[PDB]
């Protein structure tokens, strides 16, 4: 009895505590599994698996137990299969993907453990069950049984089941299993495909509507899994499907149409023609069908047939499009999101084959429609088609209808819709140069919506400017872009940051277009307005404001004072280390522009004075800033100033220039090659110095110099620096020794493993353990780093009495 309590203790140490406790306890259960026995152990495990309280990760760990005990127990599980299975089976039907895959995993392991004959003998009485739910799970159980074991192994059982004359429920479940096998396995079906089709094939012909339905769904699932291969396997079922298509009705026909839709993409171009035409006689009739399930199918079959290579673009243009537009492109279809997405997709695929203009010309008449949701549907379709195919196909007379309708739809939607914003931006960007005649109408429509009283509605108008200002450049740009910008300049006082971010995102788009002299709110008025906005808490505002101040610095440096730029740099300074990636990247780019704007000298003098007087947070920000002023502008303008700060006889400023140099070398990368010789003597002083933090961060400079200059020569200067790094190998402070290991791992790359080995050899067998520990730690980094390179560099070691240590193959001559 007490050993069952040990199972509790072991379960507890898996379900709770540190990972080695879990690992040990699992090892204990699994090796003890033979003694515990399957009966007691599953009487105890299955209650946890049945508990509603069990988390996903608890369940996953319990599965990681179940796999191993099943492997250990093996044949011992055979009496308990029935009990184990009924607790597990519901997982196969759980909506949670992970609960589901876990159930499949443990049925797989249970099926490897228990003999096939026992799985069959367990689940066979459920094949014949009256409940479709029991049959459904049983079908999913057997599919997993098939997956774990060989598919051929289960075939002789399926061959008996699908011909089980005494119960349609049984024959039905057989074909459910054959469907579920295809859904589970995927393309792995293919070498067993004809064996599976030849099990189903008689079912399509059967006297029971249920069996015909499930066999058509099995054939759909097999065809889906086989795509694009395996057509030769289905040659059996082609005749039965047409003979059914011509005859069946309702959801029993929807099943056959589903099968056919998956078969036509498998076919050669000649058969694709013949059999698509066979479909349309019935599929066009089903376009009238009231049933939403049928309507889901026929759109799928249209998408599949017209997507197939064989079927003529002209055939689609003549026989598909007229009845399709008639029955589906009408107001009633916008009402259901399922039909909505399916119709949009189907229609975009027709466009991919037949062309943009053939579809768009049947749709655009309804951009001017009454209903918002139907206008949304057509707009989403035009959005997708012109995103895929562009404007090339579209007639001038179709532009006129597009743009008229697009403008009408935008002025019509009561509430800001993303779809209308997408559609309008896409179509304008696609048309490009062709938009020129309509620009007054577009601008007026935008400007109207930009003067609207609603926050969201103005956000959408500014977003639309943001997405399309590049097209608006075309002509009278100064006139139109400029007034849009003056309206936006008023909204720079926005109460809502969501909106202000878009105002800024629209202003940003204007200055990326306008020549800065032609700006309508002059830059002298624009920048002061932005300076308080830089301090806004909201991410979208900060991003667009910093990025906009960026373009003003880049493109229009001359319009504002040195001191104006200097104050802006000093405010931007902390944003270089902001939490958000976007805010940092904007700050880095734009500090780089403003450093060019000011010129490097006084911005650097200001940064070096800040580096002496601030808290660690803002001091690290200045090290980032100084490096931007080096990569941008000139590095040679930065290093002379840093060299002078190091001549100040104070440990805190000196330590500061070492952090500045360490980041400068990380940041400028390959540019560092020009500068190693100049910075070398500073690093000698720093690395000879008594201070622990000088030697730590001089080592960090050497890491970044080394990794930055790899392959550009300079190994002379790096060998020289290694003579000052290397003595620090016996330092004991965590921070200095990790920085020294970092430097050595850098120099292994830039000087190479040969040199690093030459520094290790005399210490690997040195008398003192504290030398050996340190030298083997270094050697192991070089070895893991460069194992195959070391072959060339190992010294000649002479033979002993017992042992051969020469490498004779490398002594050979040719």
């Amino acid at each position: 009895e007490q050993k069952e309590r040990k199972i509790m203790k072991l379960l507890l140490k898996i379900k709770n505590g540190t990972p080695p406790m879990r690992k040990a306890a699992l090892r204990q259960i699994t090796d003890k599994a033979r003694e515990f026995g399957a009966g007691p152990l599953f009487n105890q495990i299955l209650p946890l698996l049945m508990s509603p309280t069990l988390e996903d990760q608890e369940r996953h760990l319990l599965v990681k137990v179940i796999d191993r005990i099943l492997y250990k127990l093996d044949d011992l599980v055979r009496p308990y299969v029935h009990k184990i299975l009924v607790v597990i089976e519901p997982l196969l039907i759980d909506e949670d993907y992970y609960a589901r895959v876990e159930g499949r995993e443990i049925i797989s392991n249970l099926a490897k453990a228990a003999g096939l004959a026992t799985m069959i003998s367990t689940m066979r009485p459920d094949i014949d069950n009256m409940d479709e739910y029991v049959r459904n799970t049983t079908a999913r159980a057997f599919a997993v049984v098939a997956s774990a074991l060989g598919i051929p192994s289960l075939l002789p059982f399926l061959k008996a089941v699908c011909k089980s004359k005494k119960s349609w429920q049984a024959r039905h479940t057989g074909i459910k299993i054959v469907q579920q096998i295809a859904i589970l396995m995927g393309c792995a079906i293919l070498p067993h495909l004809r064996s599976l089709v030849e099990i189903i094939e008689h079912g399509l012909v059967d006297e029971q509507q249920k069996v015909r339905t499930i066999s058509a769904l099995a054939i759909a699932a097999l065809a889906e899994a086989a795509t694009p291969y395996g057509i030769e396997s289905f040659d059996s079922v082609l005749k039965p499907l047409w003979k059914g298509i011509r005859q069946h009705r309702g959801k029993g026909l929807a099943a056959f149409l589903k099968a056919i839709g998956y078969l036509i993409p498998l076919m050669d171009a000649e058969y694709a023609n013949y059999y698509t035409r066979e479909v349309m006689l019935i599929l066009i009739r089903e376009f009238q069908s009231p049933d939403e399930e049928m309507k889901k199918i026929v759109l799928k079959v249209v998408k599949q047939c017209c997507g197939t290579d064989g079927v003529e673009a002209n055939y689609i243009k003549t026989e598909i499009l007229p009845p399709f537009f008639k029955h589906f492109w009408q107001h009633r279809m916008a009402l259901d999101r399922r039909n909505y997405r399916q119709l949009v997709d189907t229609t975009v695929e027709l466009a991919n084959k037949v062309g943009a203009a053939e579809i768009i010309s049947r749709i655009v008449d309804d951009l001017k429609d009454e209903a918002e949701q139907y206008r949304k549907m057509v707009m989403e379709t035009i959005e997708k088609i012109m995103g895929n195919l562009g404007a090339a196909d579209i007639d001038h007379k179709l532009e006129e209808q597009l743009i008229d309708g697009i403008l009408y739809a935008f002025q019509e939607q009561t509430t800001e819709d993303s779809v209308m914003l997408n559609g309008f931006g896409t179509v304008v960007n696609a048309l490009g140069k062709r938009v020129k005649p309509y620009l007054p109408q577009i601008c007026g429509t935008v400007l109207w919506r930009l003067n609207n009283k609603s926050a969201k509605v103005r956000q959408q108008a500014a977003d639309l400017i943001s997405r399309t200002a590049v097209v608006m450049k075309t002509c009278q740009e100064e006139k139109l872009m400029g007034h849009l910008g003056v309206v936006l300049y008023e909204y720079l006082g926005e109460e809502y940051p969501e909106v202000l971010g878009s105002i800024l995102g629209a202003l940003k788009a204007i200055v990326n277009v306008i020549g800065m002299h032609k700006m309508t709110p002059p830059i002298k008025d624009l920048l002061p307005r932005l300076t308080p906005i830089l301090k806004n808490r909201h991410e979208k505002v900060q991003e667009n404001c910093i990025d906009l101040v960026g373009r003003i610095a880049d493109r229009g440096a001359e319009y504002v004072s040195a001191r104006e730029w200097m104050r802006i740099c000093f405010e931007l300074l902390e944003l270089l280390k902001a939490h958000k990636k976007a805010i940092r990247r904007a700050t880095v780019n734009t500090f780089g522009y403003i450093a060019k704007a000011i010129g490097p000298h006084d911005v650097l003098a200001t940064l070096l004075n800040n580096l002496k007087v601030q808290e660690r947070q803002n001091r690290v920000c200045t090290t980032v800033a100084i490096a931007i002023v080096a990569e941008t502008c000139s590095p040679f303008t930065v290093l002379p100033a840093l060299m002078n700060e190091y001549r100040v006889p104070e440990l805190n400023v000196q330590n500061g220039v070492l952090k500045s140099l360490s980041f400068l070398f990380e940041y400028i990368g390959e540019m560092g090659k020009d500068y190693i010789y100049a910075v070398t003597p500073l690093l000698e002083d720093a690395l000879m110095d008594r201070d622990l933090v000088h030697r730590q961060t001089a080592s960090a400079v050497v890491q970044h110099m080394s990794l930055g200059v790899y392959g550009f020569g300079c190994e002379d200067s790096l060998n020289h620096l290694l003579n000052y790094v290397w003595p620090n190998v016996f330092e004991t402070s965590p921070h200095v020794i990790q920085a020294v290991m970092g430097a050595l791992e850098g120099l292994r790359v830039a000087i190479g493993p040969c040199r690093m080995l030459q520094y290790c050899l005399q210490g690997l067998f040195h008398p003192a353990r504290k030398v050996r520990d340190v030298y083997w730690k270094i050697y192991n980094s070089i070895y893991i780093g460069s194992q195959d390179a070391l072959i060339a560099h190992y010294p000649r070691i002479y033979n002993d009495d017992k042992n051969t240590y020469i490498r004779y193959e490398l002594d050979y001559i040719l």
């Binding site: 009408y408 002025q411 400007l447 109207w448």
Partner: peptide
């Protein structure tokens, strides 16, 4: 002011075309 004049023209111009 063109802004509302052209707005009213757009909406009426469709419902005349309808």
């Amino acid at each position: 002011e063109e802004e509302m004049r052209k707005r009213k023209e757009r909406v009426e111009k469709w419902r005349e075309e309808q």
